[model samples]
Target chain A: KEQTIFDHKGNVIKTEDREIQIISKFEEPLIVVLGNVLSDEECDELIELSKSKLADVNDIRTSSGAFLDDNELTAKIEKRISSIMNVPASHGEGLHILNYEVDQQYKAHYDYFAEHSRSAANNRISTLVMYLNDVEEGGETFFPKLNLSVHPRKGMAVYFEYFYQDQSLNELTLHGGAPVTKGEKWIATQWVRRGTYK
Target chain B: EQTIFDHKGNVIKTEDREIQIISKFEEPLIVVLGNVLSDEECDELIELSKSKLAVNDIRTSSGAFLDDNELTAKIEKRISSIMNVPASHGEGLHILNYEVDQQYKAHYDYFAEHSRSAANNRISTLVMYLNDVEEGGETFFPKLNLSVHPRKGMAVYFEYFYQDQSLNELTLHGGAPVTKGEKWIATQWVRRGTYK
Candidate 1:
């Protein structure tokens, strides 16, 4: 047993093996680690990167598809997530950058392998989304059926399984983020390639 | 006979009383509708009437007493044992204008004279809230063994006496007034008035 532990607030407490979890069930084959990922310094570095990019573009926009059109940093973030989520192990395509801004938003949509030629040949196994920034007023991820709204926190991420009980895509797992009321929110997304990306 | 019309929400499916209450099986007894008085309202009304609303009779088996008006109204609204045998009274009694403040404590309701009366002759009550107190006023029945926070315009109604011919040991209730306001309640009693 770990002698002492403290939460985000820094009040020391005991520690247990409860934090690590195993996947009794893998849907869309995605699991998430919402714990702190980047240090404060890393957050500031990303903040500066975002500020520099903000002036060039109007506002970033992304849907369930690829960001083959975007630049290096966004692609790099997705590549990092793909590696962490073990994209090659899951048998799906690579990652994509989804940009959600104040007005430019992605409506509720799923990553459909059936529509795309390359992805249609293989299963788009899992999805990994990393929250890049923490904001106060907005950035609520919604699940209409669960009546659940989760805010985005820096370095923390949320992952949902796209596959179903029978190993098919769970269409009901469809979800989207509400528009940011005040500040901006960024996400680095990944999809694992399954079967053959013909 | 008054024309029994349909309730608005079709709440009364049949006028034949087929919708027998399937909820509570507790034996004949009392109910407490608590927390109707805010201290400000209780104090203002008591001061307006300049009345000392305290327990008038301390002889109850449960030691639950009330002031003159409260006692009279409680008695008037109480049901009679004999009348119940003859026919259902389609309605109940109403106690009104009760002022209890933060200084109030809770107590039970039991008649000293008929502690072991027949199950049907026991007590059940409907609490009609008259006012909303911002702070405190509660009804507590120690015998029915229940407590309730009867808010303004919200009535808490309950009954006792199951078919098993046993006494409801849970008829004890009490009142609790918080630090902010006094309380008010009007309760209807089932099964026998004091005089009749």
Candidate 2:
């Protein structure tokens, strides 16, 4: 179905969590954007906490994948995100703080686990990607199936769901990071599964 | 369609629109009220407001009409219904029309602070959309980071002043350029006090 970005009244009210502005809802895969999800100080603090760990990395992603600890400050952030996602904080995976230098990229892939595989996890039902810093150019999250790309804006989040209520996977949710053409990208990602993962 | 309400107020969803409260800073009450008129009514209002076009600011756009009682009386009645104000308490309706490339820059719907007319400034506004615009023509409030796109028969409502004559700074807004197609709208500026 070709969902409208905003109906005649120009209000987007789909999510149970955050106050989102409907950017586009055309074709397959429902996507939404919420601006100013974090403050400048918060973005800086998260980066400062993780930047040193990525200093020695030279992998395809150019960073370590350290999960955010349940410290006082982090606990506060998790509660805020869980409230917006309508998921209990206990059900969410650790917030993955990441960074990618210029020319680094992530090819297209589904956030859900492979149908035939078992990986100590249930399906990743929903995903939230928040940009910690703005990219000078490139670094868009592109959904090739829909031919839609969302640019990263500092403190804004791009969220999508990949499974139906019946636990069926939506292949249309396939997405990946476009290569950064200039500067770098900083982002925090949270994946909410159907239930707690052991 | 489903409907829900929050700290703002009631929300209504129709076949073509989803009306909801978009209160910014949790101060002034605002809502993007849905479908105030039908297609037929919008066309008729545009036809009428065009007859009495007057000069105003770029954002004010263009506006009508009638010795023909059947025409003007019915128009008044519709405006009153949508605005939820008595016909006697309303000012003449301004049927706003904008052409391609025309734009209304940042401005305030509330009266200026020093003007004597400011004594009885407008209390509320119901700007009704008469047609769907192809491109551009969005009402933007920067401080709120909110914008309302024009859709046929839908209207945007906001209150800018208290009955005590205080203004709300949150109500600052502007119109974008009509890049692709022209636009037609009917505005009902409900004043706090009666007009002479």
Superposed by TM-score, candidate 1 places the C-alpha of residue B124 at a distance from the truth, in angstroms, of 31
The total number of steric clashes, by the backbone 3 Å criterion, in model 2 comes to 0
Name the lDDT value of residue A7 in candidate 1.
Answer: 14
Q: Write the per-residue lDDT of candidate 1 for residues A51-105, one digit (tens) a residue.
A: 4544333334455433333346444444444444444432534434455667544
* Every model: Cα RMSD to truth: 19.4, 18.9
TM-score of chain A of each: 0.60, 0.81
For residues A13-82, what per-residue lDDT tens digits would candidate 2 score against the true structure?
3333344333322223556555546778878887776664444334523333556666775776777677
What C-alpha lDDT, on a 0 to 100 scale, does residue A8 get in candidate 1?
18
Q: What is the i-RMS of every prediction?
A: 21.2, 14.7
Tens-place lDDT per residue, model 1, B43-155, is: 44334333433444221122222344553432332222211321132123333443433333443333444566433353445554555444444454443323344444334
